[PDB]
Design a protein around this ligand. Structure first.
Ligand SMILES: *[C@@H]1O[C@H](CO[C@@H]2O[C@@H](C)[C@@H](O)[C@@H](O)[C@@H]2O)[C@@H](O[C@@H]2O[C@H](CO)[C@@H](O[C@H]3O[C@H](CO)[C@@H](O)[C@H](O[C@H]4O[C@H](CO)[C@@H](O)[C@H](O)[C@@H]4O)[C@@H]3O)[C@H](O)[C@H]2NC(C)=O)[C@H](O)[C@H]1NC(C)=O
Ligand SMILES: O=C(/C=C/C=C/c1ccc2c(c1)OCO2)NCCCCCC[PH](c1ccccc1)(c1ccccc1)c1ccccc1
Ligand SMILES: *[C@@H]1O[C@H](CO[C@@H]2O[C@@H](C)[C@@H](O)[C@@H](O)[C@@H]2O)[C@@H](O[C@@H]2O[C@H](CO)[C@@H](O)[C@H](O)[C@H]2NC(C)=O)[C@H](O)[C@H]1NC(C)=O
Ligand SMILES: *[C@@H]1O[C@H](CO[C@@H]2O[C@@H](C)[C@@H](O)[C@@H](O)[C@@H]2O)[C@@H](O[C@@H]2O[C@H](CO)[C@@H](O)[C@H](O)[C@H]2NC(C)=O)[C@H](O)[C@H]1NC(C)=O
Ligand SMILES: *[C@@H]1O[C@H](CO[C@@H]2O[C@@H](C)[C@@H](O)[C@@H](O)[C@@H]2O)[C@@H](O[C@@H]2O[C@H](CO)[C@@H](O)[C@H](O)[C@H]2NC(C)=O)[C@H](O)[C@H]1NC(C)=O
Ligand SMILES: *[C@@H]1O[C@H](CO[C@@H]2O[C@@H](C)[C@@H](O)[C@@H](O)[C@@H]2O)[C@@H](O[C@@H]2O[C@H](CO)[C@@H](O)[C@H](O)[C@H]2NC(C)=O)[C@H](O)[C@H]1NC(C)=O
Ligand SMILES: CC(=O)N[C@H]1[C@H]([C@H](O)[C@H](O)CO)O[C@@](O[C@@H]2[C@@H](O)[C@H](O)O[C@H](CO)[C@@H]2O)(C(=O)O)C[C@@H]1O
Ligand SMILES: *[C@@H]1O[C@H](CO[C@@H]2O[C@@H](C)[C@@H](O)[C@@H](O)[C@@H]2O)[C@@H](O)[C@H](O)[C@H]1NC(C)=O
Ligand SMILES: *[C@@H]1O[C@H](CO[C@@H]2O[C@@H](C)[C@@H](O)[C@@H](O)[C@@H]2O)[C@@H](O)[C@H](O)[C@H]1NC(C)=O
Ligand SMILES: *[C@@H]1O[C@H](CO)[C@@H](O)[C@H](O)[C@H]1NC(C)=O
Ligand SMILES: *[C@@H]1O[C@H](CO)[C@@H](O)[C@H](O)[C@H]1NC(C)=O
Ligand SMILES: *[C@@H]1O[C@H](CO)[C@@H](O)[C@H](O)[C@H]1NC(C)=O
Ligand SMILES: *[C@@H]1O[C@H](CO)[C@@H](O)[C@H](O)[C@H]1NC(C)=O
Ligand SMILES: *[C@@H]1O[C@H](CO)[C@@H](O)[C@H](O)[C@H]1NC(C)=O
Ligand SMILES: [Br-]
Ligand SMILES: [Br-]
Ligand SMILES: [Br-]
Ligand SMILES: [Cl-]
Ligand SMILES: [Cl-]
Ligand SMILES: [Cl-]
Ligand SMILES: [Cl-]
Ligand SMILES: [Cl-]
Ligand SMILES: [Cl-]
Ligand SMILES: [Cl-]
Ligand SMILES: [Cl-]
Ligand SMILES: [Cl-]
Ligand SMILES: [Cl-]
Ligand SMILES: [Cl-]
Lengths: 527, 176, 352
């Protein structure tokens, strides 16, 4: 029986057997007042003392959210859906620590993604026990509020100021600063890591003065705040808060009374209407996301990035080879996960209208022009592949590269990767390639479990990624120093070197997607 | 090894085996097949060509290095033999420009680009394709050792071809 | 020392660690250990460093050896703590008597029980900490003696004796490799033989004798000390490297063993300054100069002798790799000590 005294109370954990060793897990420690009733839509409030022993032996509730129902019964989608009850009472975190208890272990804090509308830290692919066992780091992960309940904004109004889910994250970071030493952790060696909206989050913590003393270093997997989906404009946010009000019968004029009315609706009514606050939007649109609130975010983040107003530290950033393909089977005509989705020119153009809805005809023609000058006129998969690259370059790759360039220009070491291994177990079809989300299981070391159907080469790849991530967290340098590995060079805005991650040959390459990103980053923002 | 290195000591041959058989997976059936081909190709062609180019460029002259990795669609040898010795020649001489002759469209484009780069090298000392938004071919210098890959898909600038293998053949192996 | 040396007239902010062989390896681990960082200023490493092959016991070696010691003393249990409690009731002599046998193949000099990655003093494998710059940023002075390996040869290598000139044959050489590299493959040992036996003259009788000593000294001391110094200087700090090549006039070991492991120490501690004690005048001058350079290093971070028209000691940088030779005749600046040998031990041999 292992009991740790925290600043707010005792917590009891449980022992896990991992690779013939032991890991101690504390699942579901509360870190804030449950944001219920009058606390709905507000910043998270500090948690007051308890005097008994809190049993942290099961994952806690996941935050309320609309789940993915486009592929019922299919593991490729359902692996991302919440696996604990949904509840507004969801502000909990998880701690995995090595056994025996470490003396001053580096701490990895995971922030899940899911478009700021979904996600939970209890997913199988985020299980921190392998990292704790294999690299003797402490892994922490938190639930934070998503969708309108986490990001509804009336800027300036503390009844619904925006960015609440980011403040949830920030309060979990504070909890680690105050408490992880009792667990054997070093609060001066904390690395944030996250994927998709979790990476965008990590990048906003680099920008937020309130987060600067709460962590050391940062890892951004397939996301950054400058991605086009990651920050909601204050005009978008007001229109959407107001549309949600009308849709729920809560239109008022004392702005605070819209909020009080929204506070009496059941979670289900709020969730049901979230999808429709945007005139044109898909199962994946970021209806309620981060905003410039004047608190967490003091200015438009593109300005802060460009002018060097961010935490000066090392970053590790990267993207997967086929980021865009996942999005195509949620609406683009002609696409299906159950066939090879050979689409025509007309379907391609229709697909652009779905992914770029309020873009001019000329804007969409310019995309088509830049992605359809083929090397062979007659390859049937031309348009299929182009649409996926369009979506992936615009939404993930070019923003991640621009973030890394702009961040490194202020003097800090940055390391960039390109993950191009397709999991042997991937349940999605081969045409979707190296999908968004599917590096995570390598980062968390799932292929280290030989019982679990991965190949030997995937075991070696995950082992190497785990070591590089751990070395980055501990030492600020993502090398594998012992096994004659390719050395990972720093990314500099001139040479733009990056490391490819695959089972065969790991290589140093330069200027990823050079011609594509000049289109998205330089020209396209004008249209 | 005994056939390809006949008057080499037992230790010499063991050292080749040591440097080419530390597998990424113990159990891939083609491990030894692929290793023997790489042994023969690195010793006899690739490492000497790279060493020549380094030593020649060290005296001040522009050098350009390529790595040809396209397997001809018409190749009559089996797939396991890959991008064989001799089989870039037909691209250099422009045979795939003859549409009547069973090559793919991508091979026509590749041969056309190689022919232009060779011709530009002969005429101007610089193997660029300047008109069709092509990857620029950097000079090979003994420090950075940049080279151009030639294939139908994506033509890329890479660095330090066969670095670990050639340190074996060029630095150690001549001692045995 | 931090808490008490001021009462003795000492400056706790000017503390230099120095040590030799396992003591130098220790000094180098204090550079790596966060708990030691505020306890000293500067460091001197004489014939050792933690990256030497004998200096850090693997956690797998260490468990096997703790368990073998348990069986050998009748303390095998399964509550791990109860092995220890049982070991705590044995007499010191019983523990000591069984230490030698915890390793299947080992000599009077093997490091049966050494430093380990304990997660406390040592938070990670030290080679990783060195390579990634995780160590105390300060000046170091590092060096080695010309014949580090010879001492080990008379503790087991066949054909060797301190009481004759130990001319050994090829077969004895190969046998000697098996003693010094016991769990190394046949190919590994052949590769050592290949790199150390391409003679300048086929027929010099002492060829194999000299080669075996250089094998042992380069692998165990010189190449690790040079690699430590390169890797440490790459993070910005001044490092100074020496090569001690004076054979003590009083040395009781035979001349063929040369400038042995351990035999710079008496010069460092100034024993030849005692004229009553049978050293030559040149050895008095050499010890006096070494003592001044060591003291200047401790006090000022710079091992010069500034007053007597001495060779200036350059910093060691990973590009030029300059080092200072220490001898009674002529003290010289040289470059890239053991270049070809160390490329073998440091780059190739760890693969075998
Ligand atoms: C938080 O966890 C603790 C401990 O959790 C356990 O610890 C590990 C080591 C394993 O043993 C796992 O089983 C658990 O994870 C919880 O403490 C348990 O509380 C129960 C109460 O339900 C206790 O069990 C029984 O013990 C007493 C011994 O005297 C019995 O007498 C009790 O039965 C009585 O119930 C009647 C109620 O009026 C009473 O009048 C009768 O006379 C009857 O005898 C009791 O059921 C025991 O203290 C713990 N259980 C175990 C297996 O150790 C703690 O409850 C958890 N906190 C929660 C759930 O909020
Ligand atoms: N009510 C609709 C909610 C739909 C949820 C879709 C799940 P995400 C995902 C990505 C990253 C981390 C966790 C989950 C996804 C993809 C694009 C944009 C936003 C979210 C997914 C789906 C299929 C394959 C891969 C990822
Ligand atoms: C800002 O919101 C208005 C209103 O949105 C409508 O009402 C909401 C409650 C919700 O159900 C939305 O889906 C509705 O669209 C948007 O105005 C609508 O725009 C569409 C197409 O442009 C049009 O067909 C509707 O008739 C409009 N409805 C009204 C009431 O004007 C408006 O487009 C939003 N602004 C932006 C920039 O998207
Ligand atoms: C691939 O499938 C899409 C999706 O169609 C659905 O899923 C299929 C696997 C099958 O079960 C169909 O019955 C389903 O309707 C096909 O897209 C449809 O294409 C035709 C015309 O092209 C028509 O039925 C619909 O308009 C399309 N439906 C959607 C949702 O786009 C597509 O044609 C298939 N492509 C190939 C190459 O087989
Ligand atoms: C790990 O230890 C085993 C056991 O060591 C033996 O028992 C000890 C108490 C001690 O007396 C040692 O000297 C013994 O050797 C090693 O296994 C032995 O290996 C040798 C040669 O390889 C063999 O002849 C013995 O029969 C083995 N004995 C047993 C009990 O298995 C083993 O080699 C050690 N591991 C390593 C990597 O050295
Ligand atoms: C040098 O001496 C070694 C050691 O032999 C012992 O010490 C000698 C000084 C002398 O007192 C001997 O009687 C001792 O046995 C000699 O090594 C021996 O060599 C012969 C065969 O070569 C044989 O007696 C033993 O196998 C060896 N013993 C050992 C312990 O190695 C060596 O031959 C002498 N070399 C020279 C050049 O004189
Ligand atoms: C509130 C929620 O989402 N989940 C609860 C959980 C469920 O409500 C319950 O399992 C029915 O679905 O109930 C938890 O608490 C239980 C107590 O009500 C009771 O003492 O019986 C159980 C004893 O084992 C248990 O403690 C749970 O099962 O953990 C609490 C959880 O938040
Ligand atoms: C734990 O370690 C602390 C020092 O942390 C160091 O600095 C930060 C920035 C990281 O880079 C980390 O890896 C370093 O070790 C000490 O100040 C503290 O006293 C230590 N505490 C315990 C209990 O060991
Ligand atoms: C002793 O000297 C102290 C200063 O030490 C200085 O700094 C360290 C880092 C060394 O380089 C040392 O040689 C320097 O002199 C003073 O702070 C202290 O007050 C002094 N105390 C007495 C009693 O003189
Ligand atoms: C109405 O608006 C005023 C002014 O902002 C505010 O003080 C008040 O709390 C709001 N609600 C009510 C019920 O008065
Ligand atoms: C390095 O290789 C060893 C086997 O030689 C393996 O056990 C270990 O997991 C590897 N380490 C990393 C970090 O890949
Ligand atoms: C360049 O492209 C044109 C068509 O746009 C083609 O006809 C020509 O052969 C190409 N030239 C080279 C050198 O590849
Ligand atoms: C036996 O093992 C337990 C568990 O580690 C430990 O608490 C105990 O002190 C050990 N010894 C005895 C005598 O119980
Ligand atoms: C320098 O030379 C003088 C004599 O000229 C001698 O007494 C002194 O010991 C020497 N000092 C050093 C540091 O060698
Ligand atoms: Br948006
Ligand atoms: Br070799
Ligand atoms: Br050892
Ligand atoms: Cl690609
Ligand atoms: Cl077309
Ligand atoms: Cl590219
Ligand atoms: Cl452009
Ligand atoms: Cl094999
Ligand atoms: Cl290569
Ligand atoms: Cl080599
Ligand atoms: Cl010498
Ligand atoms: Cl000989
Ligand atoms: Cl030398
Ligand atoms: Cl060599």
């Amino acid at each position: 029986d292992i009991i740790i005294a925290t600043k707010n109370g005792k917590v009891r954990g449980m022992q896990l057997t991992v690779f013939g060793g032991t890991v101690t897990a504390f699942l579901g420690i509360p870190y804030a007042q449950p944001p219920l009733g009058r606390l709905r839509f507000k910043k998270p409030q500090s948690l007051t003392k308890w005097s008994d022993i809190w049993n942290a032996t099961k994952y806690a509730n996941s935050c309320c959210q609309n789940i993915d129902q486009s592929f019922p019964g299919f593991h490729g989608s359902e692996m991302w859906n919440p696996n604990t009850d949904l509840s507004e009472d969801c502000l909990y975190l998880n701690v995995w620590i090595p056994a025996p208890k470490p003396k001053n272990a580096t701490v990895l804090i995971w922030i899940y993604g899911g478009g700021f509308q979904t996600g939970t830290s209890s997913l199988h692919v985020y299980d921190g026990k392998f990292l704790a066992r294999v690299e003797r780091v402490i892994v922490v992960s938190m639930n934070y509020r998503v969708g309108a309940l986490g990001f509804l904004a009336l800027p300036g109004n503390p009844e619904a100021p925006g960015n609440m889910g980011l403040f949830d994250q920030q309060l979990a970071l504070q909890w680690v600063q105050k408490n992880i030493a009792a667990f054997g952790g070093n609060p001066k060696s904390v690395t944030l890591f996250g994927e998709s909206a979790g990476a965008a989050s990590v990048s906003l913590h680099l920008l937020s003065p309130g987060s600067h003393s709460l962590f050391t270093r940062a890892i951004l997997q397939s996301g950054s705040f400058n991605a086009p989906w990651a920050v909601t404009s204050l005009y978008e946010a007001r229109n959407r808060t107001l549309n949600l009000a009308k849709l729920t019968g809560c239109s008022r004029e004392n702005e605070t009374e819209i909020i009080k009315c929204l506070r009496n609706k059941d979670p289900q009514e709020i969730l049901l209407n979230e999808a429709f606050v945007v005139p044109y939007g898909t199962p994946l649109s970021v209806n309620f996301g981060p905003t410039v609130d004047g608190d967490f975010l003091t200015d438009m983040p593109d300005i802060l990035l460009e002018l060097g107003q961010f935490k000066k530290t090392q970053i590790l950033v990267g993207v997967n080879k086929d980021e865009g393909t996942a999005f195509l089977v949620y609406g683009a005509p002609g696409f299906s996960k159950d066939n090879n989705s050979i689409i025509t020119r007309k379907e391609f153009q229709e697909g652009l209208k779905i992914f770029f809805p309020g873009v001019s005809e000329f804007g969409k023609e310019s995309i088509l022009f830049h992605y359809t000058d083929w090397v062979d006129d007659q390859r049937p998969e031309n348009y299929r592949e182009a649409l996926g690259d369009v979506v992936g370059d615009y939404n993930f790759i070019c923003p991640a590269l621009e973030f890394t360039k702009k961040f490194s220009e202020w003097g800090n070491n940055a390391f960039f990767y390109y993950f191009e291994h397709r999991s042997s177990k991937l349940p999605w079809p081969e045409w979707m390639g190296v999908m968004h989300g599917y590096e995570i299981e390598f980062v968390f070391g799932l292929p280290l479990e030989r019982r679990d159907q991965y190949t030997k080469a995937e075991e070696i790849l995950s082992r190497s990624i785990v070591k590089r991530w751990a070395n980055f967290a501990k030492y600020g340098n993502p090398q594998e120093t012992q096994n004659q590995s390719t050395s990972w060079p720093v990314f500099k805005s001139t040479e733009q070197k990056y490391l490819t991650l695959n089972t065969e040959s790991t290589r140093i390459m330069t200027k990823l997607r050079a011609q594509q990103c000049r289109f998205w980053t330089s020209f396209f923002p004008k249209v």
